[PDB]
From a paper:
In the crystal structure two polypeptide chains, labelled A and chain B together constitute the asymmetric unit in PaPabC, and the crystals have an estimated bulk solvent content of 45%. The polypeptide chains form a dimer and such oligomerization is required to create the enzyme active site. The PaPabC subunit is constructed from two domains. The active site is formed in a cleft formed between the two domains. The PLP cofactor is covalently bound to Lys140 that is in domain II. However, we have been unable to identify electron density compatible with binding of any such ligand in the substrate-binding pocket.
The enzyme, encoded by the pabC gene, is labeled as PabC. Chorismate is first converted to 2-amino-2-deoxyisochorismate before production of 4-amino-4-deoxychorismate, which is then converted to PABA and pyruvate by PabC. PABA is required for the biosynthesis of folic acid and by extension also of essential metabolites such as thymidylate and methionine. The absence of the enzyme in humans and its essentiality in various microbes suggests that inhibition of PabC offers the possibility of new therapies targeting a range of microbial infections and structural studies provide useful data to assess the potential of this protein for such early stage drug discovery.
Author numbering:
A (entry chain B), B (entry chain A): 2 to 271
The structure:
Amino acid sequence: LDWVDGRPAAELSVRDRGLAYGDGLFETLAVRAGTPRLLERHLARLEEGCRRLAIPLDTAALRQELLAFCAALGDGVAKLIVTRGEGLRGYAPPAEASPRRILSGSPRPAYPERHWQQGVRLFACRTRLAEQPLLAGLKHLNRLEQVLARAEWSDAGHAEGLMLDVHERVVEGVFSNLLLVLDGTLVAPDLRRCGVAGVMRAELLERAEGIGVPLAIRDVSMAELATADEVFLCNSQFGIWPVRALDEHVWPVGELTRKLQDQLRDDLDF
Amino acid sequence: LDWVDGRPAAELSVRDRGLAYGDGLFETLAVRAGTPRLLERHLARLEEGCRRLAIPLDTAALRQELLAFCAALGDGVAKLIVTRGEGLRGYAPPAEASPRRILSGSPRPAYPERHWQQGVRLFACRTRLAEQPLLAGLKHLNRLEQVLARAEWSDAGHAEGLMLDVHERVVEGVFSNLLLVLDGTLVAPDLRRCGVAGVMRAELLERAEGIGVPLAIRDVSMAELATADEVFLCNSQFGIWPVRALDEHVWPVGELTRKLQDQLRDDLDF
Ligand SMILES: *Cc1c(COP(=O)(O)O)cnc(C)c1O
Ligand SMILES: *Cc1c(COP(=O)(O)O)cnc(C)c1O
Ligand SMILES: [Cl-]
Ligand SMILES: [Cl-]
Ligand SMILES: [Cl-]
């Protein structure tokens, strides 16, 4: 399945701004029984990106179109890309821009359950996240940093990689967020300089507060990570992977990590 | 005129990685008398981008295809985008990717001669350039910082905007490079952390060195900019615009500036 602007289409104009400048946003939605999981959260992040990038998307008409696409897809993944649309001259956002809405469907990808069960080893990526507060948190199309980090390893012994910012602060994975427990306190790295504010990160923070777990969003150092009670990665496709190792560091699978897995599995079928 | 992979075509797959992640490079070439101006500088930049991003482009063949496209165009602008090509999974560059080669032709941009003759006033952009040494200097497709900066003004009284880095260093324009002259030295801001290494900037550094002007590449502060003897912007399309003002700062059109304009006029059809 591929749609452009709500009609079957597998191609778009070579003059699109999504292609020219990565001038756009994306969401990757798990689909079950014709409907997207965690729909509200995916929509909330897309809408906030459209606000901050001033892309005149009608997010209300989009929810309809997306719902119809997911019903046609039935089961798997729906990737939505919104671009600012056709480019006139150069960088200037055009005045009367019409955003392109591209929907592409795929099968559930093959995330191994053993990563959820036994946990994973992170690759210590050397590619750093640049600090850019105007784009921080948004799931925009400028993803060359993730492409470069992903390319640093190709083996099966590492399921994800650790991305630090240019001050070596601990930020996130290559395609997932990282959270850690420091004193029975659940700590999420602050994403106001770089990173992607994950839908699962937002979901788990709210669920942990629901159960009385003390939270903090703040800067986290490498030294703090090495001494953490437990560590895990999350995203809206695999849910939670406990982190067991990073270079010489090891961590056991933690109690809070297991409690949240059990909540995600029973409540939402992760 | 629009070609994809050397064949007339106005569309590309919605699954392309240039659209998904801005996983690619571009060159905007001025076409004069049936040929791309500064062709070897554009291809050197594109080649070095392909090396640093590991995009397996046959640059020798691309040269032939570009030459044929520019002869068909005759005069105007040929924009080349090269993308890593079709996207199988997520961020990982695919194993056996075939890059896409997109060529689009346009009329010359319409620039007032007054900008060349008398110079321009710069807008003082608030958008900063983040520091990412892996991407620095390359004319890659992750250009949302240029989109946001260009969005800061829409009036005809500012021809360009000055972009600083996140530590307030003077780096470049939104779509052109900045150079200064101090006590007879042509000084270029250092582009090792961010910015695009312009083909006109490279041309002018080599021209100035060729006539015995000493060069320096280094970090430039706002205070140093303010006390420069001459300031100008440069790019492959407009050539050179003397910088006459930035907020309250004022500069005359300088002697080395006008010498280099005369070279561009006499030697490169400007
Ligand atoms: C999507 C993404 C995340 C987190 O995603 P969710 O699926 O929204 O929880 C984290 N990092 C990067 C780089 C991403 O692209
Ligand atoms: C292209 C570009 C330049 C300079 O370009 P040339 O045309 O190569 O001389 C400077 N800055 C940005 C952001 C650019 O895109
Ligand atoms: Cl081919
Ligand atoms: Cl003025
Ligand atoms: Cl610092």
